[PDB]
Design an enzyme around this catalytic site. Sequence first.
Site: not given
Length: 147
Positions: A39-41
């Site tokens: 999700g934090q890519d």
Amino acid sequence: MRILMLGLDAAGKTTILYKLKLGQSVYKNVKFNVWDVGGQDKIRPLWRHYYTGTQGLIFVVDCADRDRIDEARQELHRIINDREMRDAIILIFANKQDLPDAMKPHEIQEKLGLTRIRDRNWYVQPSCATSGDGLYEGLTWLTSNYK
Ligand SMILES: Nc1nc2c(ncn2[C@@H]2O[C@H](COP(=O)(O)OP(=O)(O)O)[C@@H](O)[C@H]2O)c(=O)[nH]1
Ligand SMILES: [Cl-]
Ligand SMILES: [Cl-]
């Protein structure tokens, strides 16, 4: 050896890299790239990364983070299925083994679905990145399996 180090944010990637650096006296041919997945890519889902030249993958997992192990599993299988990653040797750092009730390597194997990875070399290394335990042991497995 061209090694890619991936994992969800807060898995311990930065810590492992600085601890591996600290272990060198005051692996010369190893090259490393590193980024967060999940999700934090910074790039997903609108674009893909490119994995060209990757020979080894280090996938770092926070073993005390049961809430995100399914996300880690999904990212791992998506990455290793990229055309450029089909020959990559896989080292899993089962990180934060110092924490109470952390998932041990056999539970990591089951939760990451490693048994369904056929025709490819993989290994799970227990580690504590803050103390440096297991880091050189994992990097030695990876580089020796490459030769
Ligand atoms: N208890 C414990 N904390 C860790 C370990 N490895 C890293 N950390 C901590 O977990 C947090 C995120 O680590 P970081 O290396 O920045 O993760 P990154 O986002 O994957 O680069 C930091 O506060 C690290 O100190 C470990 O083995 N045990
Ligand atoms: Cl991608
Ligand atoms: Cl895609």
